[PDB]
Amino acid sequence: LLSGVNRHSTAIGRVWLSVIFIFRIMVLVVAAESVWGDEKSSFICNTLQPGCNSVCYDQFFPISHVRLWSLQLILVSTPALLVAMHVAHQQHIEKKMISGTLWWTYVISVVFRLLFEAVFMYVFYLLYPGYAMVRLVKCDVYPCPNTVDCFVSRPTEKTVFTVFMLAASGICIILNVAEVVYLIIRAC
Amino acid sequence: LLSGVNRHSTAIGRVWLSVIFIFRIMVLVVAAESVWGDEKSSFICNTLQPGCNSVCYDQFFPISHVRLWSLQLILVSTPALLVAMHVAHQQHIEKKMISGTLWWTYVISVVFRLLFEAVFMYVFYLLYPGYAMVRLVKCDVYPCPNTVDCFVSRPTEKTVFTVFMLAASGICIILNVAEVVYLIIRAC
Secondary structure (H helix, E strand, C coil): CCCCCCCCCCHHHHCHHHHHHHHHHHHHHHHHCCCCCCCCCCCEECCCCCCHHHHHHHHHCCCCHHHHHHHHHHHHHHHHHHHHHHHHHHHHHHHHCCHHHHHHHHHHHHHHHHHHHHHHHHHHHHHCCCCCCCCEEEECCCCCCCCEEEECCCHHHHHHHHHHHHHHHHHHHHHHHHHHHHHHHHHC | CCCCCCCCCCHHHHCHHHHHHHHHHHHHHHHHCCCCCCCCCCCEECCCCCCHHHHHHHHHCCCCHHHHHHHHHHHHHHHHHHHHHHHHHHHHHHHHCCHHHHHHHHHHHHHHHHHHHHHHHHHHHHHCCCCCCCCEEEECCCCCCCCEEEECCCHHHHHHHHHHHHHHHHHHHHHHHHHHHHHHHHHC
16 A cells, blocks of 8 residues: 555554655645646747747646656555565465565665655756746747747646645655664664 | 029039939839838737837837938928029019029028938938848837837838939939039139
8 A cells, every 4th residue: 555564664654654645645636637737728928929838838847746746656656565565475375385575675665765755856856946936937949939928827826735745745755764764773 | 393493503403403303202102102001000020918019110110211201302392492482582572673692592502402411311321221121120128028020011112112212312412412513613
């Protein structure tokens, strides 16, 4: 399951990480179509040149925030689901017919989840510097003549939801670091 | 009358100047509404901002070529008409009841006509450098956002007529200089 457990997960990996993951899922569900639903259609530019709106939008939004967060959530949930599948497979094999291997697998899964969180946060920072979206953008790309003034839709609400998602991801990274440190200390 | 005579006008002031003046009048008549008729309406810009076309047109055409040439022709014809009126007044006075004063008046009239020709040519050069009109103009003036691409109507035909009018005005200036020099030489 999401942020799955393996009989080795502590309190900060069984109680808090699952809550944060569910919170992110619910926020993404309630903001996916309400806020970013008309990101493309409501996006208009101040020009008479045909085809300038689409090229400007693709220039300023290479990949939307909602879909980037969706990919981040899917890739974060993948290692936990893989670990759960492996645990079920091992149980089935034992029934048809070990703790240290499971412990190391869980540690590697937490490490990979932390790595995915960090890389997705870095990608988000690289694509969209800052936490705020501006109402007006200046675009100079073919076929738009010189510079044109495009207007983004709902910058303030998108900024609020971006702050929420970034804070949640930072909390997830902190909790993953704490979980890794706690497991290392307990093992030694 | 136009480029009027005063019994003192030579061959280059009675035969050629009148022909050039009539040629300019006819060219202006046949090009006033045919070419510059839709200079404002056909003038369009590549923007969705309301009111940008009018401000751009006023920016790039402070005063149209046709009306500038009309003012030049009126001011050039004014001294000749004034001299003719003065001659008629003197004839009426003599009938109711002198050559040197008339000669000096004619010389001053030719000088003033030359001065008006020169000043109008200089003004035309200052407002519109070069002899050619371009199809595309870049305009950055309020309320137009940044720079906009405006398109002029009939640049080639207007260039041809500008060349015609400038050549005619240059010929007029040369003939006026020749007339002044010839009168000065004959007097001395």
